[model samples]
Target chain A: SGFRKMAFPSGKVEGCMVQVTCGTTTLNGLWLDDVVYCPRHVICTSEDMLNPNYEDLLIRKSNHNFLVQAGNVQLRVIGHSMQNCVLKLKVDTANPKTPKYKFVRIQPGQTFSVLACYNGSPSGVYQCAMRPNFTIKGSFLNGSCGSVGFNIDYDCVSFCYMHHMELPTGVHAGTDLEGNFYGPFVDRQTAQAAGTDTTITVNVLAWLYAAVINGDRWFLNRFTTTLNDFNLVAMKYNYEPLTQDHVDILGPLSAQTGIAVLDMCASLKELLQNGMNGRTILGSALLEDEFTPFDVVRQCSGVTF
Target chain B: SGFRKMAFPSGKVEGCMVQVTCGTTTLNGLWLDDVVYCPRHVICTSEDMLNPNYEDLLIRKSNHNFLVQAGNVQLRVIGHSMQNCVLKLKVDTANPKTPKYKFVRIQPGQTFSVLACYNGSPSGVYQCAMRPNFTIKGSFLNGSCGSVGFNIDYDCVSFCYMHHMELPTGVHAGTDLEGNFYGPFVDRQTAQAAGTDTTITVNVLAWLYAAVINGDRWFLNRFTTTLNDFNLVAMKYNYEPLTQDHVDILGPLSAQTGIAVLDMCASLKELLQNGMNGRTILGSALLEDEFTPFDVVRQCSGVTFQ
Candidate 1:
């Protein structure tokens, strides 16, 4: 029912971490990469949580939190057991046939964060189903009937993850600003001031790049806002304001924005290294003048296949 | 064990004429569009032919013929009781999941000709099945299990309609050509020479338009060959080939290509009037900057929906 904090032994802790709480709790100006641990004694549970179907899923009480607000949602998987598991979060289930957003083969033992979107609605229902990885005849498969030997240890379960994030209209969950919770301009200023230093820039860019590549609108808006503010500061000092032309020069990067966060981060690393000329090298791969973002990325990166 | 032709007492006789010999008899060449009536004798019979599943199928013996050949196959259903019935033809039944091509609500008292394709393989087998249309709970439906009140009377039967046609490689049935059976170039030249005359063009274009609209590669190839030759004559006279862009300007006339042969013929009337512009009108609907003649016709005609 409420946020719970659990103890972790020294070697390496496994299971999910609570990234942000937007609705009722104050953001308290914790920047990205700062782990916001839940307080002790507020245990969140459901009757279904204890019932693990196919394999043992150690979803520790510490792994859960109540982000009881509107317009923001994010979670990270933790634990060695969760590796190779498909964790799906679906916002609507009225039509059961619809597809759920899936995180396949999640990384082991840390925050494999997936940014959730809340479109300013105060109340909503969400369910997460954990399908653990298993194999039949050495071929790994999802525990669905369509797969061969599906009946053997078909232990997947769905549970109501969260409900009704209470908030006033346009008050996003994870930041202080009511309307501009996605932007949080004050935080952008601090981050921009730290942008010149390579280590700090790397950390900020890594965080922002993860959000942008995941196509998380909430984080994308925030990163784009930070970029806009950063360029404004640059222009004030008579330096170049980052233009769409510069972004476009990143050629395939513009189109590859919604690729897997790691791949996009790697591409960003190349851009950060080569600066602007790398974009020309990427843009040259485009075969035709008329193209989709996917098309542009495919030609430049040669990874579409 | 020979080609048996049946008589059709009709005002308009338009269906396939079989030409092949099986077991032991020579198949004399019967010219296209001519009805060859078999002798009163040499009637073939099956023990199951008279056994109708529901009420009475009324499949008349007069409506039957045996095209005993090595590579050609065709059939005609000849009874009033079989009206509103679906006849499906399946080729190569060695596999249980073979696709069955269907013809529904066949015309009464006439040859509802279905053009068959034969690639001259000796091992091919084919069969036809019939299911009469029936009513269930006031809604007319196919007599299938999923239909409402399907248990009432599901009188459907499958029969060996025709057997193997022996031919060497590249000799397709229906048309007489070694490898290019689909493109009867001689037919194209005759149609092209007769193109200026309205009545003659009507018959030829009406026939070609029906095949093209069906996306029947057999007919499409032939029609394109005809169009190519037709245009070759026009180009020789310093005129544009008949493009779909020009054809589309003829409007609903071109849209009717996918319609029945008669309707397509009516559209050809308008195309004949518009001439080469009709061809260009048809051509413009194609998205690609360059396309095959078939593609140009396919896009402008819109029979893919049909």
Candidate 2:
């Protein structure tokens, strides 16, 4: 097979190489830097992906920041609380070889708070942006009379990367010819014939980059928060509230998507300072293949853990 | 404790003694003649009774007539089709100690026809009176790609012993004191010693017993069909068309309830023949504790595999 590595491609994966087995048959999907490789569709149709019929195939753990490895999962034991029951948490994949990088192994006694999610203080809770059939079931603990099963589901971070986190692009949302609603299209102008449209259409790289670097400082804050969020939980499970030190740790942990959005913005800032790639810059002045739109979105929504 | 048996209590319970366990906590329920001991309440709140919290805690199997047993269960394996898949059948309980006597263990390809069930059956297909989380799941058989589970649920026998089956006893449905319905009461007479009301108050048992014995043969047929239904599925898994011999087999198997209704009538025939219990009677002429009706109904609805 052609080498379609995952990490380097889109620069989106937080981490993990997915490998699973249904009954006896084994399946595989792995991870790394950016230009990555993983099924963008279906994820894994079989329970081999741990539970294909339920949640997202790929996982972005906003909780386990230590960046360790457990088999295919890049991380082992993460953080949580004991608000509900009493038990030990495991640094585990939902199942061995499951596509997810990491998820806290919930035991009967163990618990976590509802407030701890991505981009928040005091990270010890793990959450999924997609939030599908995320459950903690199986006889959590043995009962005196019999074995009763437990099914505790923690709160999800709740974010749809496509819907909630808006790209800074200039495209707008509206109806297409069919009238169905999940739509998107570009804005148009009527000044085409008056030479106004021509003047407005100039693709100047210098001012464009300068404008973005000069734009909202809030996006940088989004960067700061997500980054600090990743690192805060990377250390020992901090059940305490968020402190400035927690923010410092989070900064490096969510480095996956963090570099995706802000890294481009900051790199462009340097490009805006000089031009023509004085060192023979190879990447486009503004790569539409990657960034696309003229204006960068100021802030992100439905932030993830 | 004092012996609280099941079979001879309610005059219901086609068969089987329910005994179960959650993980290991054993539970108990048994049946026999009638006037029995079984949890009339939460049938079996624990999955020990096979599977609790789903379907009727009790089952009136319209299939699997042989009435065999496996462990605490009185019957093992039943019937099914081959239209969709293939495999062998087993007389097994849903779980070892499950309250149910029998349920067909669906391997991978085992199948049963949809047509055969209670009063009208060529038999072989298994159906339940109370359908629940009745699922045949697990990797039916190993798959090369992987083990995909199979969760096939057959059509239920479709009858509520309480709701679908109406007894011969005279009872009507109406609104209650709170107007929620499920109400029943007696008819009143307007005549005040006008001779009309006094004339209507007759307590004769001769006409009542005679009327029922001479009534529509439909109830008798309901009895016959249920008996035949029980026996038809008793033999080897017969996938062939139902033969007259199949009816012959069913007649004898459903003997449990057959004597319940008809035997009583036959006994009354002799009583009507001669008074005072042969020379001197013993039991009451009419027992309201058992049969409260002034009139004997002609037929029974919602016939069971009983």
Candidate 3:
């Protein structure tokens, strides 16, 4: 049915801070669901194409039912892609020397499910064609433009956000009938704090489930065209930029000097610089893994094989 | 009691090209001496398998006995595997850019012994089934075969085919010097042509004792289906098939090509238009090493990393 549509006033307020007011539009009979606007202009719209019945396209199960139990580690492929995508998962341990590598391949619509070890720490990264000639036909628009096809050559998804899950072993008794414990306390006070007897119970695998998001500021800034958008997000968050004073106190220092307390607010400014400029000292690690603060300490401690 | 086993005439004829004639039907009592022919035809016979009762499959004695020792090389296996098989060996050079790959594998009966280099050249490919239900057994055919087996998905044998022996440096003079002489140098003309050099000698870890049997033509055509026959001694004499011209030039190029110059004679005249395939511009140099004619020229003719 032909329709008459009325759109609301949506505009950007630019100053020291940029603000975008987004309002929905209504058409009598047409579905203008996928509309993108930038300030005064309606940048893109899918007005002609028929609605994609994506209900059938959703990935329900994996080819192997997601239970890829291999040796010491279990692996799973998550997320959907139109192209053949590769995902590398590694079991990073306390001793960085013995990190194990594993990989899996996944096709469109399917995601992964893995059962990993409780003690072994796991992390992963996903990589695929940046702008594949194909499109997310089922997820988003039906047909899209792209300069490349699916091939092995392409940068990986930069420094992906990694998360882990922890499971508690049911029994929680520090010691048995005879009273035994484990530790080499730093000092007498610490030893006293530990308790004269083995009495306390702690979550053993809780540390293994810790999650961290290593933001790649360089990736965001380089791919973005203007400072207007970056400032918009920064101003919204009330973020301030960092200076040399910040680096002197919050930056990585020489081993003999010891570690300095990293200021989260100051670090935010640094992150903004990297994010806005798209340049970061942070890079890939361990054949496609990331280096966290744990690695920093591992190096500073002068540990070797 | 060990008398005439209605034995066939089997003898060796020696000459430029050695030949052996084999005959058939032997006496049951006496072990037929030349025992390679067939089950019914006793061309070769050995009375005992106990001689191979090698308590330890000892591959020793030949320090030079094991032909593996090259310059600027020190190889060591950093892992373990169950099967008596070697997967692959790569020539990893410094600069990480140049890595050439080679491979081999050994069954239970056969073992490999090699010597490789290690001077900060480490780029390796590691692949394996994380876990495959399998087991390793001692060599030879007994309980072997099927889909679920350790055939393809097992760790290959490590410490494979390693052999090396170095000789102390010595003096060299024309017609030889004090305690200095080597074998098979072609002749006097070849020896005299070699230039005299500095007395300072370098230890040459020469283990030329290499072994691999890439079968050639003459062995096949002469030995056929009729095991009851084949003039074994005739093969020993000058029964020349390859002309001197063929031997002089074509023979070496084929051998070094590492690809057998498959004799298309008894191999059927599948010599289609493509069969005479000669587009490959064949060439050669050192084995187990590299050929840097460009580097050689650059070094000799004043080059720079600038």
The digit string of per-residue lDDT tens for model 1 on B237-262 reads 33334555434433443455444333
Candidate 3 ranges beyond 4 A from true positions: A1-58, A62-64, A76-305, B1-115, B120-153, B156-158, B163-265, B268-275, B279-306
| Model 3 residue B3 distance off true place after TM-score fit, in angstroms | 54
**Any runs in candidate 1 off by more than 4 Å, and if so which?**
A1-305, B1-93, B102-180, B184-250, B253-306
Model 3 over residues A1-305: C-alpha lDDT tens digits? 00001000000000001111112211100001111111111111233112322222224323232222222333332322221111111211121111121222222211111111111211101111101111111100101011011111111111111111111211111111011111221111111222222100010001011111112222211132223343344455433222334234323432223322222223333444543232222221101111122222322221211
- Tens-place lDDT per residue, model 3, B1-306, is 000001000000000001111122121100011111011111222322223212222222211211111123322222211121111111122212111212233221111111111111110111111000111111111111000101111222121111111111111110011111221121111222222221100000000001111111221222122211111221232111222332233233334323222331112112111222321100101111011111112111121111
Please report how far candidate 2 places residue B170 from its true position, in Å: 24
Using Cα atoms, each model's DockQ against the true complex is 0.01, 0.00, 0.01
TM-score of 2: 0.13
Between candidates 1 and 3, the TM-score winner: 3
True-contact fraction per candidate equals: 0.00, 0.00, 0.00
Where model 2 places Cα greater than 4 Å from the true spot, the runs are A1-305, B1-16, B23-283, B287-306
Give the total clashing residue pairs for model 3.
Answer: 40
Ranking by DockQ: 1, 3, 2
Lowest-lDDT window of 10 residues in candidate 2 chain A?
Answer: A1-10
- Top-scoring candidate (TM-score): 3
Give the fraction of native contacts in model 1: 0.00
